[PDB]
Design a binder for these strands. Sequence first.
RNA 1: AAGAAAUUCGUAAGGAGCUAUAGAACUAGUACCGCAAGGGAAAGAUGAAAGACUAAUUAAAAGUAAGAACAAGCAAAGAUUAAACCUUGUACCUUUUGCAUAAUGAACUAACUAGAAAACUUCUAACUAAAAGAAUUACAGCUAGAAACCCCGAAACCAAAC
RNA 2: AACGAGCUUGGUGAUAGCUGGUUACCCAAAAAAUGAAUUUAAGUUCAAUUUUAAACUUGCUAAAAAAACAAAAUCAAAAA
RNA 3: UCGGAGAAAAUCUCCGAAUGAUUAUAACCUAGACUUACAAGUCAAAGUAAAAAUAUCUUGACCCAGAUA
Lengths: 287, 146, 87, 41, 245, 97, 95, 89, 110
Amino acid sequence: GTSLDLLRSLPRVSLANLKPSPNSRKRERRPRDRRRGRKCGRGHKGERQRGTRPRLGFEGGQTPFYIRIPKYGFNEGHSFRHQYQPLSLRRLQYLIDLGRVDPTQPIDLTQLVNGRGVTIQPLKRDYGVQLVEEGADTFQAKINIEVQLASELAIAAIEKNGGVVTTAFYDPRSLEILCKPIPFFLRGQPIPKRMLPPESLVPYYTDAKNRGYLADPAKFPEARLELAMKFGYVLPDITKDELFRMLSARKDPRQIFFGLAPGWVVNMADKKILKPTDENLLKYYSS
Amino acid sequence: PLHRYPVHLWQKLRLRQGICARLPAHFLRSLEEERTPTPVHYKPHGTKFKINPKNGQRERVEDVPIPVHYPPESQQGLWGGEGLILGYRYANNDKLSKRVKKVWKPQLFTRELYSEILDKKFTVTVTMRTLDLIDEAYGFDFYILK
Amino acid sequence: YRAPPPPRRRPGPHSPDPENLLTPRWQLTPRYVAKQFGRHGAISGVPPASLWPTPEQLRELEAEEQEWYPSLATMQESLRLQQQALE
Amino acid sequence: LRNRLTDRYWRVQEVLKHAQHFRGRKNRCYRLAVRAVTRAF
Amino acid sequence: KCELRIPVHRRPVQAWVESLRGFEQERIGLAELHPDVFATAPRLDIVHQVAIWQRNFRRISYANTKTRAEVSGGGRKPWQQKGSGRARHGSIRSPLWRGGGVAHGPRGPTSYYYMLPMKVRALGLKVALTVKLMQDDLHIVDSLELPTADPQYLTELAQYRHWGSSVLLVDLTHEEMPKNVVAATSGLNSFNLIPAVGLNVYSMLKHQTLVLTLPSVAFLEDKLLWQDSRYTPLYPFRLPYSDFP
Amino acid sequence: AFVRLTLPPPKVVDRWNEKRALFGVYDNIGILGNFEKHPKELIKGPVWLRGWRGNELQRCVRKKKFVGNRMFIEDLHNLNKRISYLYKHFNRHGKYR
Amino acid sequence: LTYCSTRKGKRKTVKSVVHRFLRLHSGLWLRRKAGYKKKLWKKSTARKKRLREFVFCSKTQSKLLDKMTTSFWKRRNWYAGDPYQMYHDRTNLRV
Amino acid sequence: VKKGFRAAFRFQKELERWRLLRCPPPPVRRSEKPNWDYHAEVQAFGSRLQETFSLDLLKTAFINSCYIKSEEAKRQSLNLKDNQELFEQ
Amino acid sequence: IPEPPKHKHYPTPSGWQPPRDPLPSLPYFVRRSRMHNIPVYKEITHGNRQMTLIRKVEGDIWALQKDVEEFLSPLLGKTPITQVNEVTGTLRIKGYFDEQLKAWLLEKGF
RNA sequence: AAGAAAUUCGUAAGGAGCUAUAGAACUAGUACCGCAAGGGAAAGAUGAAAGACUAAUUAAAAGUAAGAACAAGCAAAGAUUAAACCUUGUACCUUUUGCAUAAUGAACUAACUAGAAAACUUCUAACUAAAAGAAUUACAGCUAGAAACCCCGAAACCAAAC
RNA sequence: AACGAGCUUGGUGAUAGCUGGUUACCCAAAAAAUGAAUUUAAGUUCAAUUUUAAACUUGCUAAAAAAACAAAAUCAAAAA
RNA sequence: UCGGAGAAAAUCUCCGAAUGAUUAUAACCUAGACUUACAAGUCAAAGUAAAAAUAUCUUGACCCAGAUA
Ligand SMILES: [Mg+2]
Ligand SMILES: [Mg+2]
Ligand SMILES: [Mg+2]
Ligand SMILES: [Mg+2]
Ligand SMILES: [Mg+2]
Ligand SMILES: [Mg+2]
Ligand SMILES: [Mg+2]
Ligand SMILES: [Mg+2]
Ligand SMILES: [Mg+2]
Ligand SMILES: [Mg+2]
Ligand SMILES: [Mg+2]
Ligand SMILES: [Mg+2]
Ligand SMILES: [Mg+2]
Ligand SMILES: [Mg+2]
Ligand SMILES: [Mg+2]
Ligand SMILES: [Mg+2]
Ligand SMILES: [Mg+2]
Ligand SMILES: [Mg+2]
Ligand SMILES: [Mg+2]
Ligand SMILES: [Mg+2]
């Protein structure tokens, strides 16, 4: 460019020629000159001038504002409430379009996080992803996806195209392994089991209408049909579809990863998977 | 400057140099090991987990032993782990009342005890707890040995 | 001049000397030893079978599991009773 | 004493040269010379 | 040729390949350099930023002073407050007194540590490389092999070719650097030889002319370009990744 | 004021000694070395402030954490008193609330 | 307020704010009305209705509460079925 | 002893100023000072007065008889022409 | 970041479309971000100063301003206020015009 | 105001410090003060050689001397042929009140002697629906840089010695 | 050799809404002492004022008739 | 501390309230406003619901303890 041609003429760049970007630094003012010296910006003698004014929120001796308001449980149990990151079909379509979420294979929270499509924070009480209806009208992809929460309209968009959506619960410990699997294989521990939902969440994940992972499989076809009629689309028979096996693939309710059983150890250095043989240890994991 | 080793490691380093090193290996193990005495003046938590009533969630619990002062007079008798509790109380059992120094003292008795292995009778300063421990041990000799 | 060799990190399994009293305690736990197997695999020298719970350890896990994690059948049964009382 | 003012001599000379024609300690003593010079100015 | 794909809209930049085997072997090859490494926009504010960071994050100042609490003595009141005609004092070690504590002095060892964004520091290596090329101070060489180990040869070669008083030489890896080059440069203050992993903005501004072997050019282009089409780190880049060494 | 009557001895700085010549090398050890080492690992200094920065109150507390139990009796007394001085200033005294 | 803590060197939240006010991510704060549970027998029906409502805070009150709480209380929280899901953003606001 | 080299250098100038006042230097011929070219100075002299001179004659005018004696004395340890004839006219 | 997969029909259902080939012949070139989007960003300062920013501009940055002023003038009815930062290579416009300025660039093939 | 844990991570001789009122109190816990516990200083300066006779360098501080003064006045300014005469002019800092002929403090010289932090805002850049070299924030944001909040002074209170 | 309660060292750089002090230049703008709560009136917090930056459109004076009490404070179209 | 009357809004001149009895039992919800440092305090269309419209006349925060469901 023309800028580089200017460098050719100009003298060498060196440590003696450096300069910061203009206005990059403000100048700090010492209390030395008459303008900023003398009383030094503090005012005439007094409590605020000696530096001993009362604490923040003190109002000179009347009951402060933040003390005379009734105490109310807006934030009770905030640290215990569950948080589900929202994923919109617009974001899902956009990720697929640019190749960042491969639709050929099943989509699980690992793949979504692995494609920088969602950011999961188990420390801040993230327990998964909830599918968001936004973008349903323009959603034209056939995919198999597992999400901890889903909405009635969000499910309809996935299924109408012939995809599969199932809702699966991951416990706080399992989610952290799911989100960052490799920073776990490096520890050297065996893969833990996946714990069942708490009593409060059991109804949601055992219900077909929500596509629960613990729900009765025989009851799905009725649920799929009713949703199709309500939203005015024809339910597509996915058994005929060539990639039916991939669409129907589902991990065991006590399994975190698709091809890895609980209890195995992943020797990444040697590209091996140590597996136990003991009976009590195999009964513990297979339970 | 700084010391090479933390001050808490100094006693271990002392046992490991000089004539202390030449002491028997088995004897040093008794010196080295620290074991908490069986609880006497506090109720230990039965479990390692409890359900918090206020927020209704499970929270960890730990046992913190009370500091107990053992007067040198106790070393000439058989107190069953008891000692002096030097602490404070709240007057009227409300924390908005004054904090008052309080000392709880063991009830000490003089009793004569017979040892079969020694075939001698000793007169000892003892607490009711110590007598109970001997009864649970099925003999004065069993109490000392166990 | 010639610059010294570039800084490099230690390239293989590290097991600290237990006798030394300046070795930090965390490096001597049964959890730091596993970390050596996961990073370096077999060359660590950790006996594979030591990566799994020990008999006494296994019993603790199951007993704790029963106390705090009920089975699916019990959860549904407990839920049903609450609904009947509510009805 | 990481940083100490090293020009105090010339700062003093500036005020003094305007006072050398006064009479008394005003002509040689900075604390008194300084005030006398300003009144002249 | 550049191994990675150059943007379609940008044509490549070139340099003369050189040899140090002889004085007159100035042009032995023609080389192509990725325009986004050696032809980025000239940003001298960023070069200033990186040069500052390399000089300030290492700084630890060991200056210290004692406060009025840390000066020996000083506990007692010198005289009574009243009935003396003297100024009121509470200690002989206050800041006003000779031998007293320092009111606002340096306090202990202080660190100036901070980290610039990794993309910013990578950019400063790209900007610096353009500056040397566009200002005719960068000399691409095939290898650092030299006919003799006498330091006189290397200095004379620099004068014959109109190099600067100070030359920075880069080789791919420390282990394989030729013995002839080590011997000659070891005794030279102005000619410094570093491995390709030691190249930085501060040393490219201290040394007038930069000498890069061809393998180091490919080495540098790969690392710096990788920064432009990368995700944010899920976890530190020393942990296993799908496609990262 | 009073001034030197003779010029001080000339000060000579050799700019191409090994330390000055090779200053700044291995500062991109991370980006140019596959991130095996962070540059902050190349800092040499007090144990409690390698790759770290803080205000004086923060620096006092961190030194105590790292070497507090290996400090001399007189120094630990002074360090502890400095913490309490700085705590009361930063949390109770100043123009801004 | 604690500006620099002895252990962690950070600011500290004033837990009297956390137990009285709700902060919407946009920047607003909700509160109750003082006295809404007091002497209801002698209060008019219209007065009681005013008391039961959730009310907003002024600019200076919000500025104070922002000073008294840390950043963790200002993050965006994705609660399933949140009853304040729609009140965390402002719409049609030109000002 | 305060740090720095600059304050000492400034005061050296003051010491020079005082010495000249107390022991004033003997005046010296401007030629012996630097920044002097005789040929150029002569031409400037003529041009200063807005007059045209024959440089050879002007150079002779400045020459004095006493000067010649001194040069011969030093030479002893080109006769040239004195200003005499020009002086009389 | 993976290179976007080839699609049979453009625009893609999301709306994304790759830069056209052959390249535009204009004096200036606008590059795509690492996520393969047109680098137009809405920005706000002081809570009321709305701006739109075009980044990664190569070539004659001044030529791009002239085109933007002509493009946006009919909508506004007056010449738009802009700042050209030649060092960074970005053009800053007062007000929100990201949507119109993203479609505009797509047609030019940037 | 205080403040965890479960859990995860972790393999390493130097100085943009002081240079004799500074840096240790330190030439010394000495001299000296105190019955005792205890408190606690000040300072030195030749040269290669003193078996060369112990040097030099500097209108340079206040203070004096060389050289007392000469109607009239905040001591100067405008001037002037002329130092003074003539003309104009209610010392300074703080403080009262935004005024003093109030009132506080200042014998003079040299040295020393008092604004310090990043929650929000603003400015400069990197990348951008993502930013950050793990843990964080995000409905144009995120990261980094820059930008900030004094000194001296009681009567008291408590613990342990004497 | 200063006893309504000794002295010394430490806590301790005690605290002081009180007294004093708070070190170069230049350009610019600029209030108050109205109101309110306060063991609060030698202090502080809020309003109000002032100020800096930003966004975009009406502001100041004057203002008829006509109104609210009445022979100028509110209010106040067009104008200038 | 608050309310009523005069001076007439700065301090002065006077009376009362820390309720009282009557009762139709007087709901929920929601535009726009008054008043106001904050806090507290006023008025209210539309919609719905009860009934077959109406409440008439003249005051103390937070915390912390309770009571019943
Ligand atoms: Mg998040
Ligand atoms: Mg002390
Ligand atoms: Mg004392
Ligand atoms: Mg004191
Ligand atoms: Mg000192
Ligand atoms: Mg000293
Ligand atoms: Mg001393
Ligand atoms: Mg003199
Ligand atoms: Mg006179
Ligand atoms: Mg008086
Ligand atoms: Mg400052
Ligand atoms: Mg007191
Ligand atoms: Mg004080
Ligand atoms: Mg006061
Ligand atoms: Mg007024
Ligand atoms: Mg009131
Ligand atoms: Mg009160
Ligand atoms: Mg008008
Ligand atoms: Mg209000
Ligand atoms: Mg109505």
